[PDB]
Ligand binder design. Structure first.
Ligand SMILES: OC[C@H]1C[C@H]2O[C@H]2[C@@H](O[C@H]2O[C@H](CO)[C@@H](O)[C@H](O)[C@H]2O)[C@@H]1O
Length: 349
């Protein structure tokens, strides 16, 4: 078929599976969330918590699906249909190494639901406690062993792909042990080889040698807020892509529709980026495509705390908060606008 509706398997949408309901999970997990103290605001702050009631959730927006559970198979079905509408072929699943049966169950449910719609799943390896290259290797082996034969498990030219958040928290000399073909605990040329995509944060003078010396296969930028980092400043993307191409690296810039996290971080208003009825998203996605990259990542499907989600949101005013909403656009606008941009990206490939 040549209908302009098919999934794109070089488009990665960051997905969060940490939401709970009292009925399914015992608590409205993540809809309830601690409010962060101001890191510049002195001692003795008692910032409190967002209780995750119907009226007061840990987002500046409000989900069309309500306070859902990430373990509810019927929600997962709906999410996969939303991925199909957006044309995003890869679900990049947050992974926190919780080592509990509820995590294991949820990952299996997500893989199962994804496969029904031909969506693929890769893992976004988070900064879990004591993360290091040895336990990362062990965890990569675990994930490939457990899920590598699942039909929804993502591969690119035969290799799994992982995104590594805050990869700068680990020295390049440690990464080399895992990621150089000569490394002490290498994955290269093993059953557990993978494309390892690190987080490019700051300036080229720091990041270029980091990425080379760490032996990452590529890099992504994550932040939905333009200008938050050098890497999330889209006017740098042409030159970042040029460097990537010259050095055999895969650049996967991250684009998002906006940013706002002031329910959970009231002091963080400088990071707000307004959606302007889609114009912000359009501008960022256009910059990614113009940079001539081979793959794009989307921040986010459903990071509701940070207001970067493309998942449908609805107008809501409760006694406790007046939520933001998609304004002049319909709840599914960011899904269908994603599909538009995936088409323009494919036209460019
Ligand atoms: O997925 C990578 C990274 C993106 C963004 O979700 C944050 C971050 O998690 C931190 O912040 C959220 C609040 O927005 C907290 O709920 C998490 O506990 C915290 O780790 C995430 O690592």
């Amino acid at each position: 078929n040549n209908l302009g509706t098919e999934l794109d398997y070089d488009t990665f949408c960051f997905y969060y599976d940490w939401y709970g309901s009292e009925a399914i999970d015992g608590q409205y997990r993540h809809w309830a969330h601690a409010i962060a103290p101001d890191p510049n605001g002195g001692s003795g702050q008692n910032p409190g918590t967002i209780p995750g009631t119907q009226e007061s959730i840990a987002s500046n927006f409000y989900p069309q699906l309500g306070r859902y559970s990430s373990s509810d198979p019927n929600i997962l079905t709906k999410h996969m249909d939303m991925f199909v509408m957006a044309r995003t072929g890869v679900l990049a699943l947050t992974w926190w190494n919780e080592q509990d049966e509820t995590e294991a169950k949820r990952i299996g449910l997500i893989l199962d639901a994804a496969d029904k719609k031909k969506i693929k799943v890769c893992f976004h390896l988070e900064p879990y406690p004591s993360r290091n290259v040895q336990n990362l290797r062990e965890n990569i082996v675990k994930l490939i062993t457990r899920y590598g034969n699942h039909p929804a498990f993502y591969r690119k030219d035969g290799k799994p792909l992982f995104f590594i958040y805050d990869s700068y928290l680990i020295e390049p000399s440690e990464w080399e042990k895992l990621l150089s073909p000569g490394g002490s605990i290498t994955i290269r040329n093993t059953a557990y080889d993978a494309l390892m995509i690190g987080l490019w944060t700051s300036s080229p003078t720091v990041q270029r040698p980091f990425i080379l010396n760490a032996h990452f296969d590529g890099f992504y930028t994550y932040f939905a807020a333009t200008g938050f980092t050098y890497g999330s400043t889209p006017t740098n993307w042409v030159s970042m892509q040029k460097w990537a191409k010259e050095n055999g690296k895969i650049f996967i810039p991250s684009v998002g529709p906006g940013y706002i996290d002031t329910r959970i971080r009231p002091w963080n208003g400088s990071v707000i980026r307004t959606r302007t009825d889609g114009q912000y998203y359009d501008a960022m996605y256009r910059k990614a495509i113009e940079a001539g990259v081979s793959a794009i990542s989307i921040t986010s499907f459903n990071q509701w705390h940070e207001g970067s989600q493309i998942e449908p949101a609805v107008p809501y005013t409760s006694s406790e908060f007046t939520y933001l909403d998609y304004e002049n656009r319909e709840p599914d606008y960011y899904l269908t606008r994603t599909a538009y941009w995936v088409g323009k990206f494919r036209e460019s490939k």
